[PDB]
Each structure stands twice: as structure tokens, then as C-alpha cells.
Amino acid sequence: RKIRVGLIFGGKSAEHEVSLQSARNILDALDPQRFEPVLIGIDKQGQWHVNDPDSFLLHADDPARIALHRSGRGVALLPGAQQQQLRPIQAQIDVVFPIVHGTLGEDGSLQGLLRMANLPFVGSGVLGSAVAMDKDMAKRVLRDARLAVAPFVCFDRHTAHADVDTLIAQLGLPLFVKPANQVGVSQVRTADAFAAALALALAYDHKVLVEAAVAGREIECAVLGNAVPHASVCGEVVEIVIPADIDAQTQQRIQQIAVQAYQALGCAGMARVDVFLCADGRIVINEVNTLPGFTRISVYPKLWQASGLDYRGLITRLIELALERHTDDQLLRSAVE
Amino acid sequence: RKIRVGLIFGGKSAEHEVSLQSARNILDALDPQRFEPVLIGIDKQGQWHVNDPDSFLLHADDPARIALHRSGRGVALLPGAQQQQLRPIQAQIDVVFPIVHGTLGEDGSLQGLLRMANLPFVGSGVLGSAVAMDKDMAKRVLRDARLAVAPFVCFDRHTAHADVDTLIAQLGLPLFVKPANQVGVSQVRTADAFAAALALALAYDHKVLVEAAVAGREIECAVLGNAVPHASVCGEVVEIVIPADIDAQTQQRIQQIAVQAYQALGCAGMARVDVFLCADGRIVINEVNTLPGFTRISVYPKLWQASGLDYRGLITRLIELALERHTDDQLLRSAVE
Numbered sequence A, B: 001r002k003i004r005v006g007l008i009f010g011g012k013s014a015e016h017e018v019s020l021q022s023a024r025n026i027l028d029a030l031d032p033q034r035f036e037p038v039l040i041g042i043d044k045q046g047q048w049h050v051n052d053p054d055s056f057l058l059h060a061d062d063p064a065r066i067a068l069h070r071s072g073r074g075v076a077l078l079p080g081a082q083q084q085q086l087r088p089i090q091a092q093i094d095v096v097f098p099i100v101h102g103t104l105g106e107d108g109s110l111q112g113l114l115r116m117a118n119l120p121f122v123g124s125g126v127l128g129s130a131v132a133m134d135k136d137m138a139k140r141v142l143r144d145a146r147l148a149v150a151p152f153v154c155f156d157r158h159t160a161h162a163d164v165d166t167l168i169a170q171l172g173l174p175l176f177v178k179p180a181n182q183v184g185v186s187q188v189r190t191a192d193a194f195a196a197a198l199a200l201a202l203a204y205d206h207k208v209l210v211e212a213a214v215a216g217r218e219i220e221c222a223v224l225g226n227a228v229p230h231a232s233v234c235g236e237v238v239e240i241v242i243p244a245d246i247d248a249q250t251q252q253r254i255q256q257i258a259v260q261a262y263q264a265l266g267c268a269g270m271a272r273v274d275v276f277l278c279a280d281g282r283i284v285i286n287e288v289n290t291l292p293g294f295t296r297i298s299v300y301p302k303l304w305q306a307s308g309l310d311y312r313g314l315i316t317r318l319i320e321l322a323l324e325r326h327t328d329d330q331l332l333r334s335a336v337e
């Protein structure tokens, strides 16, 4: 009757601690009429630990020291299994809410594990996560959908044969140098600082984007839904200001763009879309993020709060969307001969 | 010293039996100086069974009855583990060669499981597999890379608001109706047969492509490699003819297109690229397939055979490429703070 929600959190990530705080907040807001929580923390070495709600954190109330209780109660996954798919090394989960920051948590890999275990789960599936996480691929698909993105060139080790001059002629200055995996970012103000930015970024990814500058205000907008996505009110990064000080017509066209970008990349459940709003009213997509923050101070939930969707209720909707997707997939999977 | 190769095969798939035959052939050709095999079969319900090389098939020599020995020796996966990641429910694998046909085996999901288990593995990673498998997404990325694809419209349940007339004005007749997941295909010769094709396809996927006809010969070309991919000689589907009866200049431009498509979609290890060669010499990409067949009669290995790469040696190269990728990823993963 109650649904069992497996919260998987942590990750090998600079944002590890953000995932800890999010898990705590989700746990406090989970509608206890409907959901029972099961907790799986992933430490900074990538090891999985089951915990109880009341002892999953060390120094919970100290932001500078908060950490995962590495209980050493390990987890096995049974691929192809239809029940008890998550097994203790040495509770049945009905839906997974993954908030694992870092490459594997965000890039479709964990999502693929969850599919292989036949687990419903919150957020974008394999494709949507993989595409959004790879900033090179995400921009090519956005571009093809006729949405505006910063002009850019993408390099790998084998082509980084980079001519700073041709780059400046095409893209200008300053240039933003980014590893394609959504640290290693640099604002290159002069042609001479480029070489080093290129080199730093390539320590983090096999692919590095070089982007022209976009002049404009930074507006962020929350999307929720599967096939019929909805958009929150906008927020302006000034340090966030909700609702953004922009007219109705402008908010509406950013909302519409956010939904369209989301559909193009094949997102589901949730994304935060970050755009630039230029002086002439052009809207340029900076980033589509399939794993927003879920702390009480994170932008994504505050954007929905300001749109009349409360935190408990956001969480409940994300779970319902995960179950909806799963049951629809169920029929199509079962159509194979 | 010897490398342990985990062969994972089978799958819930119409091509299940092709995967069985492939596994057998791979097993016979595996260089026993270098590799020891471990066998994991996935039955038609998606259940995983460990087997021994000498008893993994029922009716091995009868194509009409050949089936997986469902031994019931189950497999657990330890996510985050660095050793013994594949565990028997109730041999250390050093590299996985997945040839699991069907959605999960092909679409990045299994690849994501393998990443979560820190296993090196053969073929495209999560992104490359997810993108290539979704024919809608694959064509948009190809399109953006300025390679030619059949003109097309993509529908879901919520838009399939389909006007046959507008479709014929834009794309013509006949139309090819395809579920976006790479059965449910229909050649609609008249405007009146469309409705039903659209409806059949939508039983298999949430997305359905409608493509204009491409008039031309069918040429297939094998790609191998990670960052510097190579192309095989071409083969013509007449029923395959290797080498294709086409000039050197034409083979060279199809080879170049095959590599470019492969790079655009982020493929690794292996793909078979299928194109149309039109009367005027235009080359139109039909499909990039990240899981080709590996039977002795499959096109992919025959294309490499005709290019001077033998079957054992193809297999050895695919494993080397998997290990190369893995060790390079290793340094970048470990760069996180």
C-alpha cells in the first residue's frame, strides 16, 4: 500500500555534500502517508552503503564536516530480477530517487543500472541523461532543433592542432573553455592564456568545448514532466532572484524555450534550464541540467515553490512521473517477440 | 597473465538466436594464448545464467531449436566494487564482450551497468549506444553533422494529430514507418495504409519515424576503432556482395562518411554503417548499428575478413580497444575532487 522509495545519494563528486543535504531534505519532506524510505549512500570512493534514516550522516548539522555514514552494509544488484533486485551483501524498493552527483550518477550509467534491475526511477532515462551531460552533444542537438546556443568548437586530445588565431576570428574574445562533461572551466581573456585552459580542461575530459562569450542576463527555469512538460516561473542569477524581474511575454518565451530544449534532448522527470537573455531579447541556452539540487536552498525547488508547487508535492510528483514512465515502458518492452 | 573475457550474450530479442551463434563463434576464435572465457547467458525472460563453455547451449547444431542452457546459476553485480564485481548468486572478469541483442543490451542500459561495475567492455559506451539506438536522435545528430539522411518526421502517441496529406506533400510516397527504437516497420504505398502502420509502430515504441523513400543501392561498411576509427571495404546488399561492385573513389567516400557518422554519434569499438548510394552519387545514411552480428556469416566480420582482418584478430582488437578506453577513462575519472 505504501510505496517504498529508494533514495540513492552521495557520489564521487565535488557536489557530494550537496547530495547529502538533498537526501536529508527529501527525507524530511517525503509524504509518509504514501512513501517509506530506503537509504543507499554512495561514498567518495564510489562504494555503496545501506543506512537507516536516523544514522545515515556524520556531523549532519555542520556544513563543513557533514559526511556519509559508511556503514559497510553493502549492496548487490540482481540484473534481470523482477523482485528484491537490490540485495544486501551479507526492503523491496518500488521506485528509486537517484541524486548521485558525479559522472556515473548523471551521465546515464546509473540510470542504465536501474533499468537493468527493472527499477522505476526518477528523472531522465539513459539517453536524456547521456545527451544532456555531454555538452558537445547537447548543443548539437539543441542547434538542430533551431534553438540558439553559444557558438563553439569542440576539441579532443587528438585535435587539441588548435590555432588560437582562427579561434579568435570565429568566436572572439573572451572565450570559455569547458570540458564537455557537465571544474576545468576557464575564461580566456587573451589569446595567450588559451593554451593553458585547453590543457587544464583536457585533464578532466577527452573532449573540450571552446565557446564564444554571450552577453546577457542569466535566467534559470525549472521543468517538470514526462511527455507534457511544464515550466516554472523564472529566476535571475544576480545570488538568485525569484521571480525574475522580466516581463510576462519574456518569461513566457523562456518557459517555452526551456520545454522545447527539454523535449529535444529527450529529458524526463526534471531539468533546470539555464539561459542567457540578451539586450535585444534573443534567448541563448547555456545548459540543460538533468540533476538539479534538491536542498531547501537549491534553485529548482525554489522555482517550483514560487510557481505554487510545494516541496513535498514536487517530490511526490517526481515519483508519480517515474512510476508512470515505468508502467508505459512496461507494455512496449513486453511487445518484443 | 591471460585476460579473462566475460562474454555476455542472449537477450530478450527476436535476434536472441543470432546472439547464441555469435557467442559460439567468438568462443571458438578467442585467442587462447591471451584470453580465458567466462560465459553469462541472458535468457528470453531477461534472466542471467552462468555456464561452462562446454554446456552453454541446447541443440547447438540445430538452428531451428538452438537455445540457452538456463543453468540457474545466477549473477549478482556489485556496484562500486573494484574486484569480483560479478558475483555468483548462491572467475574475475577483466573485460566484458557484450552481444546482448534487444533494447537493454543495445541502448546503453547494459553499458551503464558495466560502467557502474567498473568493467571494461567492448563496443560503444552509454552515450554512443543510446544515441545510435534511437533512430530519431541519431538522424538529428547526423543531420547536424551535415551528413545526408532520409527526410523524416517523428511522432509520439501525443502527436500521432497526423495529417497524411501534409506528410505526402513533404515526404512523398512510399513512406517508411519505423519505431524509433532500432519489427513494427511498414512500407506505406498508399495514403490509406498509413494510419495502420502508424498504429502498429506505436505498439513497439513511444516514438515513430516517418521517412521519405531513398532510391539507391544498399552499401554496408564496417568501422573499427576508438578515437581513430578505420573503415572496411564495402559490401552490397543485392544476399550480400563483398567487395561491393563500385569504383575506388566511391568506396572511399562511403568509408569516409561511415567514419564521420561514427564520430558524430560518439561510437566506439565497432559499428556497421548502412547507406544508400543514389544514381547521382549522393550517399544517404540509413543506419549506424553499434551491435553488429558476429556469426561467421554476419556482414561485419566478413567485411573485415575481406579487408585483411581475420576473425580471431578482429575479436582481439575489440578487446584491446575496450581496455584502452578503460585505462584512459581511468585517469579522467580519478581527476575529480
Ligand SMILES: Nc1ncnc2c1ncn2[C@@H]1O[C@H](COP(=O)(O)OP(=O)(O)O)[C@@H](O)[C@H]1O
Pocket (backbone or CB within 6 Å): A150, A176, A182, A183, A185, A211, A212, A213, A214, A215, A218, A286, A287
Ligand atoms: N559562453 C559564455 N558566455 C558568457 N558567460 C558564460 C559562458 N559560459 C559560461 N559563462 C558564465 O560562466 C559561468 C560558469 O559556466 P557554466 O557553464 O554555468 O558552468 P557550471 O554550471 O558547471 O559552473 C556561468 O554561470 C556563466 O555565468
Ligand SMILES: Nc1ncnc2c1ncn2[C@@H]1O[C@H](COP(=O)(O)OP(=O)(O)O)[C@@H](O)[C@H]1O
Pocket (backbone or CB within 6 Å): B150, B176, B182, B183, B185, B211, B212, B213, B214, B215, B218, B286, B287
Ligand atoms: N527511407 C527508406 N527508403 C528506401 N528504402 C528503405 C527506407 N527505409 C528502409 N528501407 C529499406 O527497407 C529495409 C528495412 O529497413 P531498415 O531500416 O534496414 O530496418 P532493419 O535494419 O531494422 O530491418 C532496408 O534494408 C532498406 O532496404
Ligand SMILES: [Mg+2]
Pocket (backbone or CB within 6 Å): A274, A286, A287
Ligand atoms: Mg549553467
Ligand SMILES: [Mg+2]
Pocket (backbone or CB within 6 Å): B274, B286, B287
Ligand atoms: Mg539497415
